[PDB]
Amino acid sequence: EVEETLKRLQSQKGVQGIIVVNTEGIPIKSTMDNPTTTQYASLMHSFILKARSTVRDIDPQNDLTFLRIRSKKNEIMVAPDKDYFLIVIQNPT
Template identity: 90%
Template sequence: MQKSQKGVQGIIVVNSEGIPIKSTIDNATTIQYAGLMHSFIMKARSTVRDIDPQNDLTFLRIRSKKNEIMVAPDKDYFLIVIQNPTE
């Protein structure tokens, strides 16, 4: 797995239980992002379904001063990309 796109700091693939499968960043950071984003995605997905039971979360983007975190959840896996939004 490569992170050749400019500004990308890390890529993490997480299974549906929140366990990291592949990552381009260190283990401690991977575990932190995987656990927190899994919890956040599950809450966001639940909120979307509460608003409309026929709908589902397909993409989530969070931007802060330091990072931009993009998550593409699927049935079995989540793709998490952490990037520097200014690069």
């Protein structure tokens, strides 16, 4: 399913916007607007690729399956396993 997934991923906290990304960056889906979603998600894709390299440095067998950054104004989510790259825009609290 698609719509139910995004609905449950959004209303679980009243998230500002989430789109499903099953490809390596450059997603064409939008939740508020095309630019702030697509370019930011591609940027996230590049940095999670570099994070995968970073975690493979200590041991190549390790992989990153969970990534969150909770800062003063933003909380950003991504849970990559092979091509599923999450995005969550949310308040810090």
